[PDB]
């Protein structure tokens, strides 16, 4: 989740995430972070390493388009 | 969920003899007599001793578990025997036998001399380890307890008499 | 330093050792000289220099006004 | 020992025993030791 | 705290605490209630003490219903005077409460949060109480 910092718009998330969104991404930019950090996880899919980005999509608050 | 109905495995060759209110456990290391409620019935099978409740109310369920373990501790008593170890920690502190007696040096101006009652024997391997040994589980338990009380573990330092396995818990001292 | 209403600022290793920086009210410093030495088995020290002025919380300042 | 009219479990390692006619609360943390009275 | 904005009469006779509640016996607002098991004059300070206790337990959350009101004036003679020379002065207000009355109700908070808050509030009250949960029997009234 280092890579979802330079593909959102912020360097520091969104203060109080979940209610205010200050940057976002599509259903395929979720996959290019999946493309790099792939041996980084315990999975070997693409829509499994995208659900582990669409699940880190609310730590900083950078939501997803879908 | 029940200590009393559990069967008491009697090793060969120790002999459990039954009587009104008592059972006699004779073995390789000695003999011990166990007081037993007349309400409880001790009964002797083959290589196994059992205990039965005349009823299912409190007083009897309570006496039940107790009685079987009382006998079982005597059984184990005369066969394998019982022992506790005491771990002396602390700089100045060290121990030794003086005859059958035990001499404790534990920071008092005077050294302390404990003398073993009948059936209890003291061993001092290392001068920081002491082994209280006997066939009566409760008497071994007591003597151990008495000795340790002479200088209970400090609450601020690893200093004093310790049970083997006793964890060393300490608070800061300012 | 917390029990002196002091607000922390930093930790770094110097002579190693380990150096700290902090914001602390002049008031809660008297004989900190001697407290530190107890808190650190006499193995610690400090330097201390003036910074600024700021608000005293409401429930202390008024006692002075008699 | 705390001695009081309302003895209570204070933490989850506290234990209510009852010895010799009195309600005690014993615990690994000494501060939690209670007698009722 | 609580007291009538204005009264038709300033002091009133004492009366008696005979019998169960006239009404106020079922839950009619919240999810849980606190109900009196004994008769008493509940003082305004006792109510507000109970109230404040519950809000403080909720801290930002829940809703508190108060179903009794201290409309009864409490009189007490000036300290250390002898008997006579009229009825005393009004010194506070109380709510008359008989067994079965629902004094407080909470709503829109967890079961646990309601239970502890009602339990706590009950300790501020000079009588025994039981906590209740709104059931079908209540709604049918």
């Amino acid at each position: 989740s280092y890579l979802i910092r330079k593909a959102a718009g912020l360097e520091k998330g969104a203060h109080k995430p979940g209610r205010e969104k200050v940057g976002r991404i599509t259903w395929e930019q979720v996959l290019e972070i999946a493309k790099q950090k792939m041996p980084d996880l315990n999975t070997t899919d693409l829509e499994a390493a995208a659900r582990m980005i669409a699940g880190s999509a609310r730590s900083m608050g950078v939501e997803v388009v879908g | 969920s029940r200590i009393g109905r559990l069967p008491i495995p009697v090793p060969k060759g120790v002999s459990v003899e039954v009587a009104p209110g008592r059972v006699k456990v004779k073995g390789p290391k000695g003999e011990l007599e166990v007081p037993v409620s007349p309400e409880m019935r001790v009964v002797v099978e083959e290589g196994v001793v059992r205990v039965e409740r005349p009823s299912d109310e409190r007083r009897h369920k309570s006496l039940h578990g107790l009685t079987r373990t009382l006998i079982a501790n005597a059984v184990k008593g005369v066969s394998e025997g019982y022992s506790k170890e005491l771990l002396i920690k602390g700089i100045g502190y060290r121990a030794r036998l003086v005859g059958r007696a035990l001499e404790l040096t534990v920071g008092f101006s005077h050294p302390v001399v404990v003398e073993p009652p009948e059936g209890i024997t003291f061993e001092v391997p290392e001068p920081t380890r002491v082994r209280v040994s006997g066939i009566d589980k409760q008497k071994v338990g007591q003597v151990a307890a008495n000795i340790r009380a002479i200088r209970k573990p400090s609450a601020y330092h690893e200093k004093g008499i310790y049970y083997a396995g006793e964890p060393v818990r300490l608070k800061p001292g300012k | 330093l917390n029990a002196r209403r002091g607000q922390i600022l930093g930790m770094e290793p110097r002579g190693n050792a380990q150096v700290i920086r902090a914001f602390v009210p002049l008031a809660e410093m008297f004989g900190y000289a001697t407290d530190l030495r107890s808190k650190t088995q006499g193995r610690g020290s400090f330097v201390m220099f003036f910074d600024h002025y700021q608000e005293v919380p409401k429930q202390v300042q008024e006692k002075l006004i008699k | 020992m705390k001695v009081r009219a309302s003895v209570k479990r204070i933490c989850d390692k506290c234990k209510v025993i009852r010895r010799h006619g009195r309600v005690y609360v014993i615990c690994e943390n000494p501060k939690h030791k209670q007698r009722q009275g | 705290m609580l007291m009538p904005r204005r009264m038709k009469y300033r002091k009133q006779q004492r009366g008696r605490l005979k019998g169960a509640t006239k009404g106020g016996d079922y839950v009619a607002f919240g999810d849980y209630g606190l109900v009196a098991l004994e008769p008493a004059w509940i003082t305004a300070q006792q109510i507000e003490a109970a109230r404040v206790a519950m809000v403080r337990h909720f801290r930002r959350g829940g809703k508190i219903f108060i179903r009794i009101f201290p409309d009864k004036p409490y009189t007490k003679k000036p300290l250390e005077v002898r008997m006579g020379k009229g009825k005393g002065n009004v010194e506070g207000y109380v709510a008359v409460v008989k067994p079965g009355r629902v004094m407080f109700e909470v709503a829109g908070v967890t079961e646990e949060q309601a239970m502890e808050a009602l339990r706590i509030a009950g300790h501020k009250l000079p009588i025994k109480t039981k906590i209740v949960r709104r059931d079908a029997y209540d709604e049918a009234q």
Binding site: - | - | - | - | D25, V35, G61, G100, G108, A136, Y137, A140, Q141
Partner: protein, 186 residues
């Protein structure tokens, strides 16, 4: 959604006596009949805690009959908060006036803000046919903020069921919560 409950006949048996025997005194009636009855307290309670005055109850009587009823009113023991008497309304082909449950579907925007949805009406009175008796009456409350409100006029109502109270009546609302920040002045 339809419940059955055993129910016996009584004449001059003291309600006190019956109440002791674990039985609940009661009566059944409509336009046409009136009978002094009694049911087992414990069984009735198990039934009533889901039926209420909403869902139907049929009384299997000691003669064979099985009349479908609604609970009209239940008398409580004020001191002990326990039931001491039931009125069972024997239903017929006629339309009937009754209380229909409200489901409050949705999570109010007012709630999301620390607010609290006060369900001012948990059921609603209604003219309906014993055959056309619903179960739910759903109400969207999600669009409500602090402090907004709904008024039974805002109810939908399935075909065959008529709002039996004044539409000016308030059903549910969202108010501010208890806050310790308020205690500052309290």
């Amino acid at each position: 959604m339809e419940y059955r409950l055993k129910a016996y006949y009584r004449e001059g048996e003291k309600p006190s006596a019956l109440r002791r025997a674990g039985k609940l005194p009661g009566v059944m009636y409509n336009r046409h009949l009136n009978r002094k009855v009694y049911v087992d307290l414990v069984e009735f309670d198990k039934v009533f805690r889901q039926a209420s005055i909403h869902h139907v109850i049929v009384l299997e009587l000691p003669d064979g009959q099985s009349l479908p009823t609604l609970v009209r009113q239940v008398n409580l023991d004020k001191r002990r908060r326990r039931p001491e008497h039931v009125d069972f309304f024997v239903l017929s082909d006629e339309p009937v006036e009754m209380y229909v449950p409200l489901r409050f579907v949705g999570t109010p925007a007012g709630v999301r803000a620390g607010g609290v949805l006060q369900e001012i009406h948990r059921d609603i009175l209604v003219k309906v046919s014993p055959r056309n008796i619903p179960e739910f009456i759903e109400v969207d409350v999600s669009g409500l903020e602090i402090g907004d409100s709904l008024h039974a006029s805002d109810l939908k109502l399935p075909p065959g069921v008529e709002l039996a109270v004044s539409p000016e009546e308030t059903i549910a609302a969202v108010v501010p919560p208890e806050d310790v920040e308020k205690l500052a002045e309290e």
